[model samples]
Target: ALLQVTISLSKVELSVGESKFFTCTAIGEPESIDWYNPQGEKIISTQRVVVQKEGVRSRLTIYNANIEDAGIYRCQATDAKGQTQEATVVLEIYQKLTFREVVSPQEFKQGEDAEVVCRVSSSPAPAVSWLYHTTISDNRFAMLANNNLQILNINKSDEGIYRCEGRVEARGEIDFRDIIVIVNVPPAISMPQKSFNATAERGEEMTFSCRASGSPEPAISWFRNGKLIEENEKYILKGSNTELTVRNIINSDGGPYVCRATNKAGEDEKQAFLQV
Candidate 1:
């Protein structure tokens, strides 16, 4: 009967840049002991790795181990009769707390859902946390199981820089990343009077002033009788089309005028009456 071979540790867990030693023992004296790496290639003693044999005990030591050192290892003991027995052990290497840079959307529409992925890589897993400044409690924000941040029905107040932090207990390492969030709002028109009412005699100049407010600065346009108003001899556009002026008042101008504002989010329009 051949003597059984056994290894000191069936499984070994090591952090990156650490050292580990694996020992194999045989009941009876073996002629030789050899070690095979994860790729089934015979391992040789090197500066960072050392193999030692004493009687029936064989040891393999690795220094400053990295991810490449993680895998199944085999140790074979050859008896005097050329019979061999083998012992196997698994090695796992873990990294400390590490997170990748996250780039959030520069612009998010109001009343819409958004997601920011907080990608972290670590051994033994890591704990993730989100940090943001908000006076009011935001129930729409949530952290997913995979450490991703989600916002339901985002609003203008959600625009700011958010921090994604991570911690690894095994290595006691901490890391964090910052992501910028911007919220875009649709266009809304504002006027000095709720309803524009103006009276101008023939051959008299008339002016209609209006303003539009929104994120990304909404573009202002004018419309008359459901038709787009463009700059011409009679109609003059000023201040990015925020103001519309008629060179001369005419009976045809006595109609409903609209101030339209448009942006990436949506559009808004306000109607005004022009009586000649």
Candidate 2:
């Protein structure tokens, strides 16, 4: 009837960096056809937007579409009788799933706050979830608003792999990334007896032992009255400094002794009294 225009595509769905074209036909004695972008900016033959014309048909092509280019496209036609017609096409651009920021092989010392960072972005957003490779409880673990895992008062047992899973339900898109968590703990010393009572003769030999546990294999050292103990005829250091043997019972040997454990994380000691 009046100036008429028809577009080849009514709706288009594509991903970022993809290209598409729209074929527009003008009828009803149309003189020419023009295309308008989502920004209401007039488009013509160009590098990014290649527009071609043949007879009463106008071809609008997008070489590489970006997120900013997603929206409605309009094709307008004008006739010799001063009549005008228009057609529109809707375009939707989805961004590929990508990890904007992440933290992997994360290390945390004992008693310090720990966080496993995992940040992602996509079109329409995504549902992010966490998975633990080790059998652990959530009592010491918390989640931040950005899907990062936070560990409160971390310990040596919390060393393992953590996975971040992202999914777009509507689009059936899924992706995942892994993060490794390493925990360090200070040494803790222990002894069979808190104190030792010796009633041996003056020429009798005596031995004492100290045990401890920690991450990174804590080093054991013996201290007598706050002084570092070394191997000698009078005092024998054995079992990697965990055991100390006295050659003979002496009055001066009766005092407070400390078993010290040390590592890169921290140090701990246990005290014992040698009452002669």
Candidate 3:
């Protein structure tokens, strides 16, 4: 007579530490049945690993399962007629890394190399690097297997936003994380010009020019009686000059006015008291 053996469960998933138990039942000719661990170790023919005649099914319950329990287990049965049957079950375990941020600097100066790290704590450590506004050559920075980013030299032209980004891939699953950093470059302002007064007749053209130089070009604005005189209505601009050119000046335009020049670095102001 031929004996048949079958498992109740074929696959199982567990955390780092878990367990399962199973029993084996055989059918045909009331033969003997036995169980084997994933490594082929024999499971005693007792109730601890249940196997009974008159049934073609078996159960294997693993107790206190762990990472090491990830493998295949099998059971076999033999009938008095010299015929045999067997069943196998497989267990799989999975592991992955979780991403987290550690610390980041507030700001960095121009012409100086900056190092911004996105430190993460995980099972499989995440890849770390400096995400810059301006990307340097891949060889610009040395990357160790441990994932640390370093910049050799820094400059104003090298300023931009930086970030830390990486992904964890394990057991066909993925996790992602990111961090942002900002680089700063200071503005420049220049010294003031010598002040002077002048007289202009109403209904005539009057030009007020103020000059200064800086990284960000300076802009000149004219104000009369605390009110801004900008564009075509009250004033106009000349090439390379912040001076306001007034066309058809009216009596209302004949008064003390202020010319203000400013840039990213600083500001400058001068009084141009006008009279008819």
Best by lDDT: 2
Order of models, best TM-score first: 1, 2, 3
Give the winner by TM-score. 1
Candidate 2 ranges beyond 4 A from true positions: 1-37, 40-65, 72-91, 107-116, 133-144, 149-159, 194-207, 230-240, 245-251, 264-266
Write the residue-wise lDDT of candidate 1 on 79-176 in tens digits. 77868889999998887666667556656888788776778878878888888863222687788888878888878877888888888776678888
Per-residue lDDT of 86 in model 3: 80
TM-score for each of the candidates: 0.65, 0.62, 0.40
Candidate 3 residue lDDT tens string, 162-229: 55545444433344344434444443323243333344553577676566554356676667787877
| lDDT agreement of model 3 with the native | 0.57
RMSD to the true structure for each prediction, in A, is: 7.5, 5.8, 9.5
Give the Cα-based TM-score of candidate 3 against the true structure: 0.40
Q: Is candidate 2 or candidate 3 better by TM-score?
A: 2
**Worst 10-residue lDDT window, candidate 3:** 188-197
* Clash count for each candidate, listed in order shown: 0, 0, 25
